[PDB]
Write a protein that binds this ligand. Structure first.
Ligand SMILES: [Zn+2]
Length: 546
């Protein structure tokens, strides 16, 4: 029937700009969400900025502005980039909100009551001048192995040795320049180990990608550990109830952002029933998290345990994707392959990237390679020469010789059925996240549509006397095939689809393809998409280098 679906994307860190690596996740989720909406389901697409943490607090101080101001600006920047790529979020919030505070306290309270919170005193390097414990990377020093100066954290970039910051020669606090010292502090831990049996049964209930369920097996074998969920002041975040000086570490408050953002959305809509409908233990609504492979452990073990422990429903499934490489290698700042979302939009449109990523995506966790050379060729070849060409080639004749009126019947009903029959396969491909497959199927159909037009040679029929009817039937057949193709691609290319709809004078819906456009008036044709040059790509890389 009509499902209730809540989809999220991992929360971007407020202390950084969105790059093409991040876009892969958001575009993958958006394509899936747009398809689900097209099928009539109730979909809620949610996200938010991860805005707490010592790093955030320090960068803000270093800059002279308040963290509240810093994260506020980063939030607008991120939202501008996502809007630019047409990521159709129903709501984009922040972990730094009243909703998140309330939910973090509620969940913490329940976990504590149920006895899943443990106290443990730990020892950590402390900056006595600033009065704050120091995370490993905030301690500078001389490597005890090779004696190289200015080595940070727990590893040396020179000899590559690893060690505890307490082994550094002349340790110095990066925050004040003071010499750190050891110091004790009581911390709160989440008893993840007490959920192992439940998590095992849950993971075995056939949900996760084969590759995910397999990594989980190794994690169980190794054994689960308790996780620290507290931090000491000074800190930028929410204070733990009944624990003055203690704050919620990100492990806890970041994923709550998924809930906080949804609650914020319900409040905005004046909806007092949905939150519980979606998050209560016996919910029949579906919850999906689109995440990267680097945060699977957290979302598959810690997150569901926390939810279970606080009496909330667990995710229905986790959709994991791999990383993005450019030209076969990790993004490179020196090579100008480290491309930011905002930079990309200064040179190309969002539809091009959305199409390329989609054509390469699948239900597997494999890495996605953005080959710039291949990108230009794929876009020009597929979008411009196969799909858009189908419309432009036939639009002229219809607009100039028939007043934009399409024929009253299908020239080839059998060929049309071939295109609508494919809906089943393409729809299941979109649904199962086999995007590359959906695109292959669609392009196969596009080749077919172009072959039909080639064989009918309208530019030839257009020259023969007493063949006006034939010309109209042929060109109208081509426009109707284009109608179907654009429908299958609607989830992928939002802007191109709008321009297509303006031309066809119709809104494209999934079920609408069963009813071809007959005796229908299309609008004067206008370039739907233009070819891109390799020079455009070179300018982007140069711009990224700089
Ligand atoms: Zn060294």
């Amino acid at each position: 029937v009509a499902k209730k679906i809540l989809v999220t994307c991992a929360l971007p860190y407020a202390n950084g700009s969105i790059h093409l690596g991040h876009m892969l996740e958001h575009i993958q989720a958006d394509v899936w969400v747009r398809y689900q909406r097209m099928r009539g389901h109730e979909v809620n697409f949610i996200c938010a900025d991860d805005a707490h943490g010592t790093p955030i607090m320090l960068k803000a101080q270093q800059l002279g502005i308040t963290p509240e101001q810093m994260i506020g600006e980063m939030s607008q920047e991120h939202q501008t980039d996502f809007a630019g790529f047409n990521i159709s979020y129903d709501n984009y919030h922040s972990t730094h909100s009243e909703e998140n505070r309330q939910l973090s306290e509620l969940i913490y309270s329940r976990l504590k009551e149920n006895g899943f919170i443990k106290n443990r005193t730990i020892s950590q390097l402390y900056d006595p001048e600033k009065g704050m414990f120091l995370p490993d990377r905030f301690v500078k020093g001389t490597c005890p192995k090779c004696k190289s100066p200015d080595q940070y954290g727990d590893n040396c970039e020179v000899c590559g040795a690893t060690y505890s910051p307490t082994e550094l020669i002349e340790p110095k606090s990066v925050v004040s320049g003071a010499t750190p010292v050891m110091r004790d502090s009581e911390h709160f831990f989440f008893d993840l180990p007490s959920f192992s049996e439940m998590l095992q049964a849950w993971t075995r209930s056939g949900a996760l990608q084969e590759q995910v369920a397999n990594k989980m097996q190794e994690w169980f074998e190794s054994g689960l550990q308790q996780w620290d969920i507290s931090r000491d002041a000074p800190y930028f975040g929410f204070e733990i109830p009944n624990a003055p000086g203690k704050y919620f570490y990100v492990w806890l408050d970041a994923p709550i952002g998924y809930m906080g953002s949804f609650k914020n959305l319900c409040d905005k809509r004046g909806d007092s029933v949905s939150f519980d409908e979606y998050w209560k233990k016996d919910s029949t609504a579906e919850l999906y998290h689109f995440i990267g492979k680097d945060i699977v452990y957290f979302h598959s073990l810690f997150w569901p345990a926390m939810l279970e422990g606080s009496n909330f429903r667990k995710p229905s499934n986790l959709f994991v994707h791999g990383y993005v490489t450019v030209n076969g290698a990790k993004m490179s700042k020196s090579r100008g392959t480290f491309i930011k979302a905002s930079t990309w939009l200064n040179h190309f449109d969002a539809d091009s990237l959305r199409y390329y990523y989609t054509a390469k995506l699948s239900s597997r966790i494999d890495d996605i390679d953005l080959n710039l050379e291949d990108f230009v060729q794929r876009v020009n070849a597929d979008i411009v020469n196969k799909v858009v060409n189908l419309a432009s080639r036939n639009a002229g004749f219809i607009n100039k010789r028939f007043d934009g009126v399409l024929a009253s019947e299908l020239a080839d009903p059998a060929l049309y059925k071939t295109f609508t029959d494919a809906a089943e396969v393409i729809g299941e491909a979109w649904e199962s996240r086999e995007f590359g497959k959906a695109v292959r199927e669609i392009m196969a159909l596009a080749d077919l549509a172009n072959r039909y037009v080639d064989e009918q040679a309208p530019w030839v029929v257009a020259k023969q006397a007493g063949r006006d009817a034939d010309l109209q039937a042929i060109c109208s057949m081509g426009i109707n095939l284009f109608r179907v193709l654009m429908t299958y691609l609607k989830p992928v290319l939002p802007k191109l689809t709008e321009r297509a709809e303006a031309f066809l004078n119709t809104e494209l819906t999934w079920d609408g393809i069963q009813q071809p456009l007959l005796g229908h008036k299309v609008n004067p044709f206008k370039a739907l998409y233009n070819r891109i040059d390799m020079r455009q790509v070179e300018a982007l890389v140069e711009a990224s280098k700089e």
